[PDB]
């Protein structure tokens, strides 16, 4: 997260860290046994880390649970990043409390202008590299589809939306991918891609979760 603020420990209780010996992507807990992330974060041997603030220090509220199965969307295209979404089943159910909690799925798509919360452990610089150990947060609005398509000609599908600031300076970045975009208490987006981080006229692009609710529910019900 570039241009954000320190969330505060366990103030984003649905945020997860995907760990393969190190943090490599975020995700969101949608019920006691299932996480949603980005398909481009797929790899074998994932351990899901819940209840994290500092990812390098054991602070007392963590739950570390291995994945038993990963399901990448059937129509994911790694070249265009269309359908950049993936489900992960935990080997055992997480214990839900105030600091580890699920985020609701949307019943409606959010409109441009809605303010959302984006969070992650990704790079905090637009030029250079500095990775934080504690969770960072950014408040940002959904941009109009016209502005998004103007920023990224020929690249935006109906399964994506832009959020952030055309002036730049505030954005998601590498290492935030897979993490949540939450608006009015519902999961509306997944951190997917962009051209650099926090550059003028290049906002972040996010998977549009409301298009996938039926697939998520049907997949969870039968796996
Ligand atoms: Ca920790």
From Swiss-Prot:
Task: Kindly state a single biological-process term from the GO annotations of this entry.
Answer: proteolysis
Q: Which residues form the active site?
A: 40 (charge relay system), 84 (charge relay system), 177 (charge relay system)
Q: Which GO terms describe its cellular component?
A: extracellular space; serine protease inhibitor complex
Query: Which Gene Ontology molecular function entries are recorded, alphabetically?
Result: endopeptidase activity; metal ion binding; serine-type endopeptidase activity; serpin family protein binding
User: Which cysteine-cysteine pairs are annotated as disulfide bonds in the entry?
Assistant: 7-137, 25-41, 109-210, 116-183, 148-162, 173-197
Q: Which cofactor does it need?
A: Ca(2+)
Tissue-by-tissue expression: Synthesized in the acinar cells of the pancreas.
Q: Which keywords fit this entry according to its UniProt record?
A: Calcium, Digestion, Disulfide bond, Hydrolase, Metal-binding, Protease, Secreted, Serine protease, Signal, Zymogen
Subcellular location(s): the record lists:
Secreted, Extracellular space
- Top class in the EC scheme: hydrolase
* Subcellular location, principal: secreted
Q: Where does substrate bind?
A: 171-172, 174-175, 177
- Substrates-to-products reaction catalysed: Preferential cleavage: Arg-|-Xaa, Lys-|-Xaa
The free-text cofactor remark is: Binds 1 Ca(2+) ion per subunit.
The text of the family note is:
Belongs to the peptidase S1 family.
Identify the PANTHER family for this entry: RIKEN CDNA 2210010C04 GENE (PTHR24264:SF15), TRYPSIN-RELATED (PTHR24264)
The protein's assembly and partners: Interacts with SERPINA1.
- This chain belongs to the protein called Serine protease 1
Q: What is the phylogenetic placement of the source species in the record?
A: Eukaryota, Metazoa, Chordata, Craniata, Vertebrata
């Amino acid at each position: 997260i570039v241009g954000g603020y320190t969330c505060g420990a366990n103030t984003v209780p649905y945020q997860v860290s995907l760990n393969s010996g190190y943090h490599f992507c975020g995700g969101s807990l949608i019920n006691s046994q299932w996480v949603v992330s980005a398909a481009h974060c797929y790899k074998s041997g994932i351990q899901v880390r819940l209840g994290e603030d500092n990812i390098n220090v054991v602070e007392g509220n963590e739950q570390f649970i291995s994945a038993s199965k990963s399901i990448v969307h059937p129509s994911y295209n790694s070249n265009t990043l269309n359908n950049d979404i993936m489900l992960i089943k935990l080997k055992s159910a997480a214990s839900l409390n105030s600091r580890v909690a699920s985020i609701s799925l949307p019943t409606s798509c959010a409109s441009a202008g809605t303010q959302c919360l984006i969070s992650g452990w990704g790079n905090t610089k637009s030029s250079g590299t500095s990775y934080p150990d504690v969770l960072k947060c950014l408040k940002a609005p959904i941009l109009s589809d016209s502005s998004c398509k103007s920023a990224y000609p020929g690249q935006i599908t109906s399964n994506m939306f832009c959020a952030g600031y055309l002036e730049g300076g505030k954005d998601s970045c590498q290492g935030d991918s897979g993490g949540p975009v939450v608006c009015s208490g519902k999961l509306q987006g997944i951190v997917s891609w962009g051209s650099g981080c926090a550059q003028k006229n290049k906002p972040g692009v996010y998977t549009k979760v409301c298009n996938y609710v039926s697939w998520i529910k049907q997949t969870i019900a039968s796996n």
